[PDB]
């Protein structure tokens, strides 16, 4: 409705043309009794056991990710596989009602059939269905936030940064490390400053220019037992402020479980980009955390600081 | 490898546990000849015809989107459905080799079975499989670019903008319209300035402040036949510079077909956000274009300008 090449969203034409081929194929059965209907649900059973066997093998992948992806909860993992046990398991019981009115040997034939369907890669997802699951969930916001952060901000501020650090040391007493530490709070909730987030980190300063775009940089000196054992540059992650603010934007249904699944994905993608980047080979260093026994993040920065040298 | 709650990417444990249940179910067949193997491919045929029927009904959706999503090319639409005709159609012919060694009535039983499987929503995609297709393609960069553009930039610059426009008119001769026009070139290729992109648009100016964050909004006056019939504020789309620069970033396999599928998706999502936004009810106005007979975009801005009043 904006440009003729702009694709409109998907409609219900998949369901619409489904009943047409249903009504076409149903009247062919009128071309020939009642003997078919016991065979119909038995074949309809075999589609469900194939889907049920496709769930349990994918469950073997999921137990690798019980702690991270599913917070140690065994019930969510079974709920994550198999789609919907209600609409699947109901027709499975209805089949055995019709099945009575060498079964394991008959059951074993469909067993290995679905195995090679997975092994040969025959369970293919079409690029129509691959696309239609991607534009369905409007909050797929994780790779765009990672890729635009590297392109728009990190590609620009990192190669200049080493010169802005050394001129502060030529200006002086306090030796600041030559890396950029980006904090990634998973409980996203980003405040404006950092003195209130931890009173162990209570500096403020402005990193000077080179001597266009003006990226103000503040150096926060850790005050381990009231003493600045470490001085460093700390910035938050501006994409995490967006992920927070979409959840507060209640006109879009973005919940705190949907936010936490992307913020973990945002750190994995941003760790990938800084692996093979020309500029961040030794400059960037992400410090992710999620504090509930809420410990001090000033310690874990100092662990990342003393591991530098 | 960064935090213990950060989920690792998926492995080949789906294929790994598939052969284990294959080797388990195969030796149960040793517990009982050769009579099963003709029945096995016949059941393996019925899975493919169900997938083939699932492709053709989804094709009925795709013909609504032949021009936009598939550039008018009928062959891509069939290639977009059904996944892979090579690995699917080969086993279909191999079945009929085994089928010879009321068939349409037997074929009609599996026909309406897959219809109600689509009609009742029984073809469910599990949230494990829904997720694993989303983190597979690392360039899913369309909604993050739209949502962060509204949050980080458009939510901040639009409610201030009306005051910055009127003070230019109080300063004066030239009545500038009270809207923001964002250009979305689909052939993304964004240049730095706009005088070279069209010599019909050749102003430069700086929109003044209110009298924190400083945004330079340049006012470009249309020079219809060398005369400034229209004066307006034109900005490009900074997310489209990123989508271009990921394609030039050849370490990530982002091709010009992958870029063009997201840039169309970026404009549909950004049109959605400005529909139900409190600030952009009459301020923003997107002008998307893709020029090959490459016409002048200064005309289509003036069409959007004279349609205002
Ligand atoms: C953000 C929404 N968005 N999403 C996508 C995708 C594209 C855009 C977008 O439209 N960006 C944008 N175009 C603008 C045009 C003007 C103009 N006409 O003047 C002004 C702007 O804002 C003035 C400076 C900002 N000030 C100071 C910094 O905080 C805010 C106020 C503009 N901005 C705001 C963002 C600018 C970049 N930017 C970032 N951004 C990110 O890291 C980020 C996170 C995600 C996700 N994507 N990115 C993009 C990389 N952090 C910044 C911090 C400092 C700093 N410390 O000084 C700093 O200095 C400059 C020069 C830029 C800069 C920053």
Author numbering:
A (entry chain A), B (entry chain B): 5 to 36, 40 to 108, 116 to 186, 191 to 229, 237 to 317, 321 to 337
Reported in the publication:
Stimulator of interferon gene (STING, also known as TMEM173, MITA, ERIS and MPYS) is an endoplasmic reticulum (ER) membrane protein that serves as a sensor of cyclic dinucleotides (CDNs) derived from infected bacteria or produced by the cyclic GMP-AMP synthase (cGAS). Upon binding with CDNs, STING translocates from the ER to the Golgi apparatus, wherein STING is polymerized to recruit and activate downstream TANK-binding kinase 1 (TBK1). The activation of TBK1 in turn activates the transcription factor IRF3 to induce the production of type 1 interferons (IFNs), leading to the spontaneous immune responses. Further structure-based functional analysis confirmed a new STING activation mode shared by the agonist and the SAVI-related mutation, in which the connector linking the LBD and the TMD senses the activation signal and controls the conformational changes of the LBD and the TMD for STING activation.
We resolved the cryo-electron microscopy (cryo-EM) structure of full-length human STING bound with HB3089, which allows us to reveal the conformational changes of STING transmembrane domain (TMD) during agonist-induced STING activation. We prepared the cryo-EM sample and collected the data of full-length human STING bound with HB3089 using a Titan Krios G3 electron microscope. Through data processing as illustrated in Supplementary Fig. S5a–c, we obtained a 3.47 Å reconstruction of the agonist-bound STING with local resolutions ranging from 3.0–5.0 Å. The cryo-EM analysis revealed that the asymmetric agonist HB3089 rested into the pocket of the LBD, which showed a two-fold symmetry appearance due to the imposed C2 average in the 3D auto refinement. LBD bound to the agonist HB3089 mainly through hydrophobic interactions and hydrogen bonds. Notably, incorporation of a furan ring in diABZI increased asymmetry in HB3089 and an extra hydrogen bond was formed between incorporated furan ring and Val239. As such, the inter-Cα distances between residues His185 at LBDα1s C-terminal, which is used as the measurement of the LBD conformational change, is reduced from 52.7 Å in the apo state to 44.0 Å in the HB3089-bound state. Meanwhile, the two connector helices of the HB3089-bound STING revolved about 45° on their own axis in comparison to that of the apo human STING, and the two helices slightly moved away from the two-fold axis. As such, the inter-Cα distance between residues Val147 on the connector helices increased to 8.8 Å from 7.6 Å. The two monomers of the TMD rotated anticlockwise, which is accompanied by the slightly inward movement of the outer transmembrane helices (TM1s and TM4s) towards the symmetry axis. In addition, the TM1s themselves revolved significantly on their own axis.
